[model samples]
Target: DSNVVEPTEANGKKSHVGPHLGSRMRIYEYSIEHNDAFWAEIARRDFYWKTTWPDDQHVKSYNFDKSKGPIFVKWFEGAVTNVCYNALDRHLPAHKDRVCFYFEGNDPSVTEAVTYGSMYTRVVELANVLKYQYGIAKGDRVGLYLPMIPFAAVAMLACARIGAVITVIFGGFSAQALSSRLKDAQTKLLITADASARGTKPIPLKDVADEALKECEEEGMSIACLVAENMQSCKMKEGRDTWYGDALARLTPEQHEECPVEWMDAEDVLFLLYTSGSTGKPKAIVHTTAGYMVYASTTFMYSFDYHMDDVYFCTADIGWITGHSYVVYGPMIHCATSVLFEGVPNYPDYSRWWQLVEKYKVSILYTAPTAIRSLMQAGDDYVKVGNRSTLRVLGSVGEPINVEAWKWLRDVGGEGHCDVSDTWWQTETGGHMITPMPGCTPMKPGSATLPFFGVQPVILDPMKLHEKQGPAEGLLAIRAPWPGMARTIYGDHARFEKTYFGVDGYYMTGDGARRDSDGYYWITGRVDDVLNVSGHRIGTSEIEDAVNTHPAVVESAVVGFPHNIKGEGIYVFLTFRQGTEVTPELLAAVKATVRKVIGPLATPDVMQVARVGLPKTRSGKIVRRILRKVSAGQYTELGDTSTLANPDVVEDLIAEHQRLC
Candidate 1:
């Protein structure tokens, strides 16, 4: 059921790539054995603190017991530090003139580098405007509606520089999506770019911002809107919306030059990032200052085996946690030269990412599995043309990486000379939880190798939400609180406690996982409760109902399988009468049928034609569980062969599943 890629002697030689230095086990053992000492050293050695905790305490107090009320957790309780100071100011006088971000525009011809010293000016200028004009100070909130541009990075730092919480709404989100968060966060100010282009089409960012603000005002609210002028035809509002440069013009030069970094207490909220499109209210996940900063820096360093001089490129929008941690905070904390790409990976051509890599000589690339799978299908020539020798480590997040996509990333993207750290974490985790440290842990193609230093992962059985022992398959949960874990849902501490700690004691990740005998963790998507396509939670029966309605399909059984791009792709097994074949056109029709009823979220990806009927129990309940395993190409893992009502059909279905994939 698996293949392990143990490291070569050549791969094991780099000490700088991983903090483990010689062996991962040695450092991991010390991490657990001397928990406080190990974590305290990272906080003390790497960061400049305003005030230290008494006795150099790291995890001052924590409570996993939900019944003790709201499940309290604290890390570095009495320390004080500004994340902006550590990311920018502390690097001055030594690495001040170095290029901190290499900006690659959508057109490819437009490029610029913002130095470590120069970026502080942008932050300070914006910080002055936010503080003076908008009256946004410590403990206030702002909504940032920006694209994948340098200003977005500046705004994030600018917010953090003044100890104000900034919530970045994704560019693709609707007016309702943006307004829901804006209304909930009770944001007083909003910052957005003039306009942005996706491929060749221009998108008015300010327009979306205005529409969202209008919606907010309808519900009795108002916000000071600021626009970063990037477009030639952006219509400026008379008094409400202020241009970036115009607002700064009224502020003093000294105010812009020496805008002080507001030192926040260890537990002070840094940012409130909302989760994905939930049917219920959006979860405003909160991450604090000192503890979050410590986790971001340490996890980034080890997860990708980062170095100071490496040209790092993480292709995630600033809106998501991946971009928040790596593209902005993590790389800046390590002082690595980063490529801030203001374009999609497949723009112009499928070779867009490779061209950027070649142009920048990118050494460490952290990207989405969706992007990698997309590039892989456009033909290898798009990738093979570029020189990937500069690549030292390749990493992926956002979605699960299937074995095939993992292979492609290792072979072509790395050019057979890099480490693939298939990192596993979520927005709530704040940083890397389980991942491979390039030079430390052995590479396993489809597995997120081991837990990061402080993450103690527990496998819990789904039926009763109880702990499962070694080499078992169950829901994943954290046995203890870590520095990176999100504090609570903003304004809703009760919901956060109940949702995450439903079983008490454990922080249930809501994702299923399997731990191998070798201790490598394999994420098994959500405990299907139902199928999760991309982030859409669709019920299997609902999809099956739609599929069965198609004239060509008789009875349909739907299940989820690992998808390189979608996280979990829908696999539909349709049984038809004699000689009624399943063609691509019919499958498309079937998909369209599902889409018409349940919307695009429930549409099936792969439709497997069934020559033999589905496996069933004696009383005729479809054994859809076996179909789940079979559809994933886990033929050997199908355990109920003899007990099935029609055991002969299982072999044919399994054979067809293998052929289709």
Candidate 2:
């Protein structure tokens, strides 16, 4: 039973909005073969630039100078545009009355809808408050600690309206993680909610923010707080805290027109999204204004073959880059109605997601592979309950979609009426890089079919970083810069240079990929310690640090092991304190520690007690490579252990692996 399915001419009929796959392929080839002229025309024709580029200026310029030992790429140099204006204001005359946002809360009963006009009013009011009340200025940094709510979108747009850089920390993050980002960005103010609903439970977001504020104070970063009351009531801190509702109330109906959208230079920083680093620290991936805006909007339009009549929905948290690009900016820029879902797929029942699709008559549905696989695991009965025949386009993000999950999504979840686009991109790349264009590109179940327009991908030999063009498996690198590619890591250009551009001159995507003879790109996995667990990229160092906080755990090492459902499950190896024996109580304590420090999403799927110490090199670095191998039960492929300071440790671990098996 092959899970991969091919599209026929009849199936591809829905792709009527865009050029055929053949024409797209021809365009893609021509663009790469004739770079400067092709991209110049693409940049000119595809976007609505406020300040057009000079006629003689090229679309892109880069310096991969070996002498300087860093690569710098500039896109549409000397251009000026406002992302907010392109996203909201330009569509007003025609699309103002069209429904732009369909908000469904965690409780299935609570639902709301907002048209473009209403959204504009809310956004302008928030923008006025940011400017007149908070004294927010251009280039100021604001922190958004919000859930998957409509206000998150308003907050992002309001910040963009005034050229204030917004850094949105994931709502599920712990106080420590949130505090670190606020301190790093020197955030002037934080906009968050009092509480948010997840399934049947209520999360105290204000309390979490309060705890984070305390931590920020300890770190000497004083930040004012703006809180939104959502599901639950929260006590307001007298002077420091301000209610978002009150701020909006202070603005008269006429004040909505007073907020002006600021013209931002193309290279001005738009938002700072932090992602996991290989080490304990996090890297704040910085995306700029014009290029990111153009790339995201174009990709969303093409990838989904978005039509004016279509209802587009991407189930991602506003806190992540996916939501920043697709859920908020991309759909809005194109004046498409997008859904804002504030609950998990299985909430209420496995039918929750399917119900939303049927209720909204959603045409385009973009979500993570983990969601697809998890829904499949809930049985086809739950999926069969809803009318998902309205779905014409489907998308998968975060991690590689296994063949089983892809087919299940297409056949059962979409009722065989939808085309799945397994998109492969990262936070560093502000938008989708490689994906199948729905209705046009023929998709393979496990492959992210082709590179988007202006993206030139090359696989380099993993050992030596030499370009391997044909039918090979190695490190994935982009030969040239795309508009959506991140400009730099905020406040840490050196770290960004050392992390991405360290290998050759290519912009190294920390992922390993395989290019088939047919030129299809299949992402294998991450090359670094970052593990994609349930579609969330988490670093082993971060998980280990969380686990190490337990009193019973002397030390711990984390690795990603193959999981049937989660794609990758976190497996931890821990050494107990001196004379402490491994017990259920101790294991529970370790898991609780991780949950407290990093939240439940990061708890290890498998925790094993190591009777002996971990395998270490001569320099006392834990050989995670060997642990990963042993954990996967590949004992014979352990390779040469001659360099290890404790070769016997590997033998002992092998014994433990056998005992567990």
Candidate 3:
């Protein structure tokens, strides 16, 4: 069974897009062969850090057995440079005065743009405050919980300027999750937004910050909270809080002196980003400076085929790795213009994104498939209004994009000319490992399609070794460590080693995949997400993508449940288009579509429909494992949904599952 979906050929024939997508990629046999040479060349091209590593053919390889407890990797070994230097101070002399970031919306009537020089000035000012007032010294851990605004980018650069490791918590997270992350990182200072307007309603971000800070104090973290004022509606706290405006009132907006770039030991934790693992508790993946920056800048250039004049807009919130790399570091380091949208796609109006696109002349647009699929369900009216003429490279991140949704994005949002680059990487990888290089690589709708520079994707058996079967198709493994691979799981290194480096010398990707005869990797979702039924393994995404193929179906989440005989039965929870009603016949039609797309074994045993808007984290990733456990009658075991975007959906799903059962 080919669980992965393939795109149709240019000749209107049933040809798999995976193989054709292969010749478009530059295949490297081994990553370890010319690591130092590759890295030196990349450093020469993307002048971010001044490194002292001697040029050599190979850097280092893992001995899998020698636990040494930790791999002391000194990437750019002896490099002494600041990331902020590359982002701001080192911009081309000609581009220094050019507009770098254009922040629009929150209130669509007003627009604001910041030139590279101005943005740098702000970065220096904030960096001064962080260093002098807030007591943020070199190698310190800082927590930044902010909205998608110019200040968010400023804070990131500010921290980097003073050589502080920043952990940015998503503003949408509740106090519990935020405090837990703060405690884990031992964050010394907490930066927050006071009030932010999503669309029409104002969300009091600082109030939540106050509550989270209190929790942190209760936990004995005792971090100083710095508030970035959004509007006058925000209530100011007395002590322990300082306003960004008030703090800057006395200091001039002139360029402030930055502290010397702290010489950090290689493998020192840079940022602690949490992602949902097999369990509900988020895994705090730690990425360091040199390696993470190198990988981020490298992939940002290759994957998107970024041009100097490209106006990049990645719709991910700054709290996630997607935002950390593209929204902030990657583009800025390249001196590329960025468009930051504070509200949701439909905020202000359904055509807000389109208006912004036309206004900013956005060139490269990176977003998630879930968002694209949601907009597809929103109807053609909102999508058709955009001036997609400026769009050159269209990208899908987070999850595998279905063919139908991909076509919609290409035809509607791209207006032809744009190459839809379906990229696959994770928080752990720190940057894209598998992606198309825009027009340079032919893209397939469902496949992440090709391996990025220096990323070697190997398909292993379920147990993590080479599969002893006909084709390469069980688990996905990175044959070599790329720069930016997570150093540790925050405080717990055992979990980090066990999760990624445990199986073979290879970095266990947790996902299952297969390579066709032509050599493109097709990810079939997480291996832990695989449904086991009577000795048969099926990926949840395969069934879900197939279900979503139905015109009436907006999106779907598939899971496995215990069946007396079958061992596992397919269970599906989905949402339909706005006006569409969920009928048994419609369910049957969707199931038939699944049968046609995948096969009978992947069809859902029970299908339950939810309202159009279900729940998700700000990242737009569906927590289907949570859905699966509830469907299997494991109610008491549901871990804390406090971090979930909409925890209420769990109960809604529970009731719907019981009724269906």
Candidate 4:
């Protein structure tokens, strides 16, 4: 049994890492009872808005009703504040010398601690450069294509300082993906590095930006480029491009002394993180100022069981939402130290992450399940190389983690000391929606326990049965709007309403969930990924989980293809543990395990060993869309493999599919 970690004694004292279970439950009860009042108090206590809402008019007047128009949900309306000020300047009063970042470079030996004072000076300089020299101002869009470096964060903060809208594209994306985003955002400038290094290989950041800009030129649009002078190969044009090193050097010393923060309305757009564009053109997911801060910071502090002196390290690239919320905004808002990493998990070897944990004595380690599975495949010896006893909380995100991977993390990360936080949220929900408060909630291996305060979860009936109401299993939806909910799809409010608010009074999460008897939530796969086999509905994760339960399976991606009789058939692409093979013995074991876990009906009709591995994003999410297409013999229609860490795997897997299926 995966036992619960209680608010019990530890190190000879009552732990109190966060709220106790009873208090958590009570607070959750009171919150939903006095929903508006509770959020108002939380916003006032946790944030520093320049102006407060008048008598909490927002809560009284807000609308989640789509009876007349697109649902408009507002929080702290009419308040004015600056996100950079709250994250950086407010913390400067008590401590400027404290470490803001421990930058672990791609070359494992190269590392440095950046202080608050040091970070402040750099952000000020960059803000001045963008504001005066580059003509950037409030409401203008600035695209960030930089790699995972301290400057990537500096650029984001500097843009926030000037009240400019930000869109940070991942460095792994192809020039084609980048160009479309730049055009969609109508970005005025692209900030990037000359190149980025990951595991000794250089990703040509500037060259990719140049290719994207060249395409923009063909489209009769001209945008300036700003480069970080990391490598020597970056060639720049005299008129259109400027180097970061050069720009800072040319600025007067007085320039670093001051750059005023432009206070923004609570509803002003902060960042636009575009989701995948493979299905259609990507929709820019918009997160605004005041509420995003309140929820992101609050959730980080409570869920991670944060302490003032604890060192936080989240293995997420700055290009995604976890990077925005946990890596940058959440940690910094509380004036806590965070470790920023730029290397892959296996740069020098599989020992790199453990080395970082030991070096920094990191208290919190957050990563994805895909990463844990691969590391587990490399062997437990790598995990035991460096000390990990300092870890207090371990986190799992990106997708529903199987029970096997979840148990492995809790055991191997820090032996018996660490607790696993299986958090569930999406890009649209600014921060965590369902997660355990570290010291409080009892954990289940595959379940993300309890909703955050003010987050009211509902299980909408899948077939519109029982009036779209509750059961043990159904679609997951939020009955009410919380402070952190996304306002709309950028420039497409109609699509936003149709996507999220289609289920009457709820905000559709596009996911399915199972609520256990104890009220803990188990987030399953995306609703669209659910496969129906002979009138039996099965989410792909179910079969994948059963296959993964075997000791030899490293990872598995389950997809469904058309079946003449069953209406749909289950297909699995599996990657075995190191030195393991897809022999008859292993295949029989996997099938037997599948039968025992769910039923004989859940066994795969077709199976193939992806010798190279499943197609994964750079951040390690399996793009099962590619697997589905390949399994269905629509290999010619595979779309946008450029964002993947190893796009070459797609071709090899497709060839294997053709031969076998």
Candidate 5:
């Protein structure tokens, strides 16, 4: 019933604030200055705490200079609590048989559902399997390198139940990429299936895990692996590695005695997630326990205005931060039922996602802009043709969505009645830092619009590092760290310090942004990704995402080149998933897609489609640096072909170019 935006300024202390009243309130104003009376009010309204915080003495009077900013606050001192127990055990008596999760496979015929009580019982059993069998104890890092499955969530919750910090690397990452994270984390136990069914093809996840372990062995770290299926592709090292079924079979589905939930320090490490670096390497981002839970759960509750009865669903894989925090931990902490789709949007058909929404009666729906744009290109008739009245709050993640795609999602997918909140956050931030208040904030055309509670966003000048006293746009950064912010880099604190805190201790987001006169923020992609095409800079990823929106194309990548007059030219490569005949007409179609998505200026000067899939890292991110060199006509700098998943793709590209000449 309440959909009005908060007022612009309310008792603000002279800092440029986001467009709403809630956005303008500093951390001190509502929390410490008011003696945490504000948070007490919010918790009372939104949360169902089993045991309440102690007294006024529980709230810290002085600021702890630990994790940056005034956002960090200690509540309910000397308190014994359990988030997993709250999410599961609290609902056992009532809705025990009610289905909490409904998993829809790529094939509609292979769907599976788990009830609240059933899932809890299985989780406790799995936790026992981990404890009694593997000897998994507190603080052990368990590597999850499997595709999207219910077991993935089980693993996270199981780890939480037993006090282990699970480092879940995206299953789609290359063996080398996966190896880097595992070795960095010194992960002893790994969980993976044999292979996952993706559309018509089988993705061999175990094989990738095997290859990564081989690399780890070479790096002098041995992995004790566990394969879920007997036919797993991993090399069966008898003593060190075992089958998941063999282990699970050793113990029945007998429930383990519920162990007393261990008390954890507020600053303990929770999750170790890595982000893809622009330099082709990845950075490991470490998040702590209590703080992450408080912030992530808080954001999960507020971002979409999640209610107790809402059936939430974030169409994300748990390998990434979005999936880990949003899909699993955050929602669970809030005691909300959510959906996890293990396959692509258009796996069997474009409407596979819509059917899930209708079937599950999903109230809150969140997804990436890349997925949204691609699905939009699949046509509105395919999406809106279903009965999706169950959906109320529509959300977007990953990238800043364009206006056209945003409107299309609002109208078609939202049934022209739901609200769209373009959630803006990073792997480092753990969960959402900025998002429009769903069903509450007035919709902005292309702006992330407002910061989440206690997130102090500062848009600095790109040219000057120290120049932050005036109105200008350059780099986007959080002036302070929120509760969900990552604590350290996995193995290297120096790298974390250099990457984040070095640029004057501000948490660098690695994104370029433009703050308008009225303080509306518009993201302009990553600062380093700006391609100097004929002396004009363009964000390559945005261009590629924009280009792939063409109805004929499935995906695209953009790179810069050396040009005589312009200094550099743009090279665009794309793949057509649906269309036939890659002729001049199709080429024109792809160019038209870019033209419409962005504008004529952002159009790729040269465009071509490969006969096969593009080369990507294990995490499903395309390796564009190689293409960038080729596009710039710097064929000599195409170093180390051995790391590529498809060496032949590069060879084929070269041969095709030669033949064209």
Candidate 6:
């Protein structure tokens, strides 16, 4: 097992404690050097396959045909498996009584501890309801629009248990966003809640779903809605809506136990996760069963140093890939106790997350850097309120963590001892692609460090698609396919090939990166997000990182604006920590910091000291597109503010910018 964590080297050490020194290094070496034999042995040992791959089939682990223009890579061909059985059933009586999920609601009074036995029963009952009551069968698409409650997990497991393809829209999205996804996937059944508790406010989730369904109906589509009775007080529509609680109550114990897991081919679609695009429609990235399962579990185990006694917690909504890969399937497959938090990081107080850490004794904590910066802004008092001594491995997701925030998380959140793994991946990869092998790779504050196992990362010149050498900066690309790689976009294979794999025969990760002499990969921002200042190309995140290093800065976002002289100029938006004002002195200090970090060529041409905060999506990603539009005085072109966490923040930004202009 990957539970044992032998020490490598202390932080601030130069030369990597190198490979072959720990279990993670050994596994990574074998995975790369002996690909077929390594993955074959891994799948057999770490998973439960209904029909294992035969001897002849095991000879070929993956096949990528370069003859065909950007063809698909087939993994573990001609094998049969059930992910639900591997995640739930195989554990059986051995770990039946062990706690599986610790559900913590926004309010401290609301909590539920579900054992593996209880989780199995609930999943089976819902799976039966999905099959018998809703007529959902294999190859059907189900839509999930619920909060981070337990029912969300139940709904996801139910869909997987019956081999139905599921697409989950973030609960915080408006009717338009949900309608877009529902129509795109052509979802048959939609699962939701009557209401969801955010802080002290009740979000009418079903009302929003009803509005989305109305829009879908106008498009000549009708969807049956299964509303979970979360608050237990909302009315159900006669024929269109079914109360999930009522249906579950009607399920007999015999029916629940008799719901069989659907056997699926290894290449069959497990789920479709829709990723937002810079142009046109959102792309539905597809992941198959056996490959995704093996990759997710393997990465989760080795990256987090997951142990049987560990209480793992990944603070991401189930709508995103992080939740699907980590919060639910990955941890469940490993038979580990995981926490499902149904609230924001600072709903009641800034102490909410630290409180959960104390209450749950979380060993492995995976969260976004946005949450860390927010808590960091709230002062160390909230962080010191609880006992965070149990934390062993801390992680950062969604976006890169700035140096100050990373150091704060390591020292305060980890009590100066936990290993902070700053992970870098995307929705398309299906799992972590470039990240430190926990306890094996040495520390770097801003760098993701190394490729996970079989991932082969290379740098390419953004314009020419030519590979770059080490100690250089360029766009990121992968040379080969890994098990967890998404096969294609749902209804657009041609678009998928063009978007991911270009004419150069490399899967182009839209992000930029830098490889140091020691072979550590430091992720720059997205390719489209790079700014050509005068004659030099620099990432927007690089400037934001420099800005965030200031003592008074809480968070910052940088974007490129049209400039007559330079072609494109840097624009920065920053929010200050509490008790600090955006004074001229502070602005001058920020400019000096940027010049100091990356020469005088990288200094901001214009800066916006936000009176409030930056506009962000529900997933905590700054909506740079909207910021650019507002900065350019094109407020009318700011499209779709519906997905923002605080849409009003855009108006604040616009008014502030206009006043300064």
Q: What C-alpha root-mean-square deviation, in Å, does candidate 3 show against the real structure?
A: 11.5
Q: Please, what is the TM-score per model?
A: 0.83, 0.96, 0.78, 0.81, 0.74, 0.80
Candidate 3: segments with Cα more than 4 A from true spot:
1-32, 58-61, 65-73, 252-268, 467-471, 529-661
Candidate 3 on 1-661: residue-level lDDT in tens? 2433333232112111223444333234434456667776776567654554554444334444335545434466556566788888888467777888888857886568999988877887888788778878878999998999899999998888777889898776666557777887888998997778877766667887777788888877778888887665566657688888878875654535443455454455567787656543566777887778878987887677677777888888888888998889988888888898888887866787888888899988998776777677678889787777888778888766767878888878876656777888888888998886654455556778768767777887765376434356788888767777877787777777777776645788887888766566788766686665432345676677778888988888888777643546788888998888767899899988876554454567888787634557768877665776788889887766766788778778778767767
Could you give candidate 5's per-residue lDDT for residues 453-477 as a string of tens digits?
7676787666676546445688898
Considering only N, C-alpha and C atoms within 3 Å, which residue pairs clash in candidate 5?
172-618, 172-619, 173-618, 173-619, 174-618, 534-566, 534-568
- Relative to the unseen true structure, what is the C-alpha lDDT of residue 43 in candidate 2, on a scale of 0 to 100? 62
lDDT at position 117, candidate 1: 87
lDDT of 1 by residue, 4-75 (tens): 665534455764444333578778777777778888887888889999877654555788886786587788
Tell me the lDDT of model 5 at 205.
Answer: 75
Give the alpha carbon lDDT tens digit for every residue of 122-148 in model 2: 889899999988999999999999988
Superposing every Cα of model 5 onto the true structure, what RMSD results? 10.9
Residue ranges of candidate 6 with Cα displaced over 4 Å: 1-24, 56-67, 529-658
Predicted structure 1: lDDT: 0.82
Error of 5 at 612 (Å): 27
| Residue-level error in angstroms, candidate 3, position 63 | 4.0
Candidate 3 positional error at 523, Å: 1.1
Ordered from best to worst TM-score, the candidate numbers read: 2, 1, 4, 6, 3, 5
Model 4 collision count: 0
lDDT of 4 at 589: 87
- In model 1, residue pairs whose N, Cα or C atoms come closer than 3 Å (at least 3 residues apart or on different chains), thus clashing, are none
